[PDB]
Design a binder for this molecule. Sequence first.
Ligand SMILES: [Mg+2]
Ligand SMILES: [Mg+2]
Ligand SMILES: [Mg+2]
Ligand SMILES: [Mg+2]
Ligand SMILES: [Mg+2]
Ligand SMILES: [Mg+2]
Ligand SMILES: [Mg+2]
Ligand SMILES: [Mg+2]
Ligand SMILES: [Mg+2]
Ligand SMILES: [Mg+2]
Ligand SMILES: [Mg+2]
Ligand SMILES: [Mg+2]
Ligand SMILES: [Mg+2]
Ligand SMILES: [Mg+2]
Ligand SMILES: [Mg+2]
Ligand SMILES: [Mg+2]
Ligand SMILES: [Mg+2]
Ligand SMILES: [Mg+2]
Ligand SMILES: [Mg+2]
Ligand SMILES: [Mg+2]
Ligand SMILES: [Mg+2]
Ligand SMILES: [Mg+2]
Ligand SMILES: [Mg+2]
Ligand SMILES: [Mg+2]
Ligand SMILES: [Mg+2]
Ligand SMILES: [Mg+2]
Ligand SMILES: [Mg+2]
Lengths: 86, 96, 23, 208, 116, 137
Amino acid sequence: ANHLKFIARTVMVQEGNVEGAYRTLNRILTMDGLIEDIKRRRYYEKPCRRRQRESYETCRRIYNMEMARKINFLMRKNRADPWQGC
Amino acid sequence: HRFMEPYLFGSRLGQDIIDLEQTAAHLQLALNFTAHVAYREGIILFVSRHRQFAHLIETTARDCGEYAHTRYFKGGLLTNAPLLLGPGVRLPDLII
Amino acid sequence: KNILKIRRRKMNHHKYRKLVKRT
Amino acid sequence: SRYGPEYKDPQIDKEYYRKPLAEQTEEEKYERDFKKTQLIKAAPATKTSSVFEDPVISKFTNMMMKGGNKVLARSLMTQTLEAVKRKQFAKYHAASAEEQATIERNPYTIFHQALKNCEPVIGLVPILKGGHFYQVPVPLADRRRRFLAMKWMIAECREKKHRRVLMPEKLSQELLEAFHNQGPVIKRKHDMHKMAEANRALAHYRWW
Amino acid sequence: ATPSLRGRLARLGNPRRPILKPNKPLILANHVGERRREKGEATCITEMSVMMACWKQNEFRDEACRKEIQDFFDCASRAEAARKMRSIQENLGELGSLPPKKLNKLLHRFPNKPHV
Amino acid sequence: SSFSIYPPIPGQENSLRWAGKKFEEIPIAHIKASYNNTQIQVVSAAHQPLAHASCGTEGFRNAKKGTGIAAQTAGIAAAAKATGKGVTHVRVVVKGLGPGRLSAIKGLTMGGLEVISITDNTPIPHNGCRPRKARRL
RNA sequence: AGAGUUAAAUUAUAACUAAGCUGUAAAAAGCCCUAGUUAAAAUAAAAUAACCCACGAAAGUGACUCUAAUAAUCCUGACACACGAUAGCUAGGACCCAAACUGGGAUUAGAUACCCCACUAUGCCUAGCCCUAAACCCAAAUAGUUACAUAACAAAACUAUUCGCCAGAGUACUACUCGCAACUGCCUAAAACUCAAAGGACUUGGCGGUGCUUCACAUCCACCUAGAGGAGCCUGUUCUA
Ligand SMILES: [Mg+2]
Ligand SMILES: [Mg+2]
Ligand SMILES: [Mg+2]
Ligand SMILES: [Mg+2]
Ligand SMILES: [Mg+2]
Ligand SMILES: [Mg+2]
Ligand SMILES: [Mg+2]
Ligand SMILES: [Mg+2]
Ligand SMILES: [Mg+2]
Ligand SMILES: [Mg+2]
Ligand SMILES: [Mg+2]
Ligand SMILES: [Mg+2]
Ligand SMILES: [Mg+2]
Ligand SMILES: [Mg+2]
Ligand SMILES: [Mg+2]
Ligand SMILES: [Mg+2]
Ligand SMILES: [Mg+2]
Ligand SMILES: [Mg+2]
Ligand SMILES: [Mg+2]
Ligand SMILES: [Mg+2]
Ligand SMILES: [Mg+2]
Ligand SMILES: [Mg+2]
Ligand SMILES: [Mg+2]
Ligand SMILES: [Mg+2]
Ligand SMILES: [Mg+2]
Ligand SMILES: [Mg+2]
Ligand SMILES: [Mg+2]
């Protein structure tokens, strides 16, 4: 309100392309986490539920990061086997 | 492995180094035992599950006249030999 | 599991509270 | 069902084989059609190489057929065509010179035009959501649209006529009304379109 | 990078209050999850709207406007073609990673050792 | 062709004009996209309301106006009234996350308004007023 | 623990425009002193940072600034002393928003519930009480070891010095006592009586109005054709005789 308008969360369209500008803005909001916060703030969540959600998300992130790291590590062994039939 | 500590000389920047004095000491006894088993007409089976030198191991066993196993080891091979190999089968006297 | 004993204690406490309220 | 999956549908068009040298894209396919030992099913009795038959007419005759009286269905179709031809000729001869250049007497083209006029554009699908059925508007396939167009006219002419009036006589009038966009089949199509326009707000219920 | 795991779980050696309370043990499995199929949605809604715009102003007659109806038919044909082809292209290719069937075999080739 | 998605703030000296008017004088279009309704109000740069159109104002109903088609139609309805008063370019300010969010934006273009920028002014409190309790107890 | 301050949102309050706004799977009710934009005090709370793991004995604490300040030259140790989440009580104040209860509107055979609307105590500040939680990390404190050694699962098995508890289950977070600003309250806490069991863990089936993939080819739907349930008759049943 007190801040200047048309500065935050504003994207300029290029050559009349509106669908792509909307996708760019949606990606901006998703990467900044505003979409999830807005969807979460529709109904109040109790602190116990907030802590449970944070712990579950942290565990899921750790597991996904480790699985991705192992997949990237083992990506080398996807080549064709040179010792087939031995 | 935890049981390889007495058999290790040290670590050279992460990579463990195996001492060769104990290696030769064990290898002399191993070769003597294998030679005695072969001399006493014993069945020697070269077992190795590794898809890089399977052909080399098979050729070495063929040259030696001893037997080889470099493929998928079946479950009841040595235990349930009378049903996996034949009615009456003589088990190998040495496994390398 | 332990939920059976928890529910039994809950029912006993609820009945005691209702009895106290009535009398 | 007696034909195995390897059997392929026959080709009845004679011009497809008469000039295979006019194009090369079809050559690459028709040369390997027989090389793969592709067996061909027997040609159906209904379909032939005659130039005076149309698949739309055959489908309409099959739909009008009751039980297995294909001869009766064919006779009804021929009588309907004769009736529409004679009714068009009567109006052609009763009209003046300017209307003769506009009125059409060919029964096949007016039949096809009436079917296209009575073909619906979109249909309604009942979708269960929240324990209630909603008539979601949905685009229709070409075969479904043609089948609905034929079925509406057949059902209307089978029941909305007098006992003394015969099926070819009723169908002759109904074909002309549909061609001129005045028939109850056209009214039913408009009713379906209006229902779809009313239920357009429920189109988000569709998931395909 | 990987989030820190030191001092997170409830263990005898951990002196502080546990931070994470995993639903299931944090053991890296030897098989990745199967790819989830995307939920379908209604298509050609914006074109059906402009098609019905003709009818609402022309008393529901197709002889008034024809371009909207033809465009709606083209949209329906394109939607059907995309439903047919994407259903077999997406389950085959992802353009960013290997198929889950190959990934499961790759993981089984180099599995984890929670024991010993 | 150096193009920046950042808005042209008045503090700079860039020369960008739309129909001869600067970015500051271009009218605004506030699109409030709720979970059950979508409202559009096109106002001038001087905060003077020019046009107003909502999904309920188009003859829809309770659950009918909550769909995206209602917002797409309301976009055209607002664009027609905006063009009736001589508006060619407008700055879209979106408020709230709803199903008819992009639908109204594209309906404006369908109705004949050229969007130059999309502003997402969604009210996100910094843990201020306590919202209502969760559903499905 | 005190003193001072507010960035976002919301609202009491005014102006222009418009007719609905809100409400759900769908509706109805409610408000049309309504809704959108532009300005707007007071109260409440403190987006991202936080994929951080710090402080405090625990409860608990993460919008900003300032003051005071976080014991023990460090073992255990009560019924003694001091604290003790939310909820509730008393007196005074504030009340945007949320909400027990309540009153309407939905659904249901019933719905004094889940769903929507309005509103009260209350959640907010000062002082005084109340002293309870799945107050759980269900793992006591102090210094240690990786020796022997997997009931099962789970957070691996254990030493040395202590304190507090545990003697089948139901009765029973009960009755009767003592004590307590608590008087529908808290702590401690039995017995008669009934049974031969009460329990923790695990395996296999079965089930699931759990969820994710692949399906239905006369099969569920999207859809096609011909019939039953309407009439007479034939025939077989259930009933009266
Ligand atoms: Mg009891
Ligand atoms: Mg601590
Ligand atoms: Mg668990
Ligand atoms: Mg509950
Ligand atoms: Mg204070
Ligand atoms: Mg403010
Ligand atoms: Mg006030
Ligand atoms: Mg009403
Ligand atoms: Mg904050
Ligand atoms: Mg200290
Ligand atoms: Mg002490
Ligand atoms: Mg209180
Ligand atoms: Mg109040
Ligand atoms: Mg309220
Ligand atoms: Mg009620
Ligand atoms: Mg307290
Ligand atoms: Mg706690
Ligand atoms: Mg305990
Ligand atoms: Mg102690
Ligand atoms: Mg076991
Ligand atoms: Mg006892
Ligand atoms: Mg108690
Ligand atoms: Mg008591
Ligand atoms: Mg059937
Ligand atoms: Mg019959
Ligand atoms: Mg019948
Ligand atoms: Mg009958």
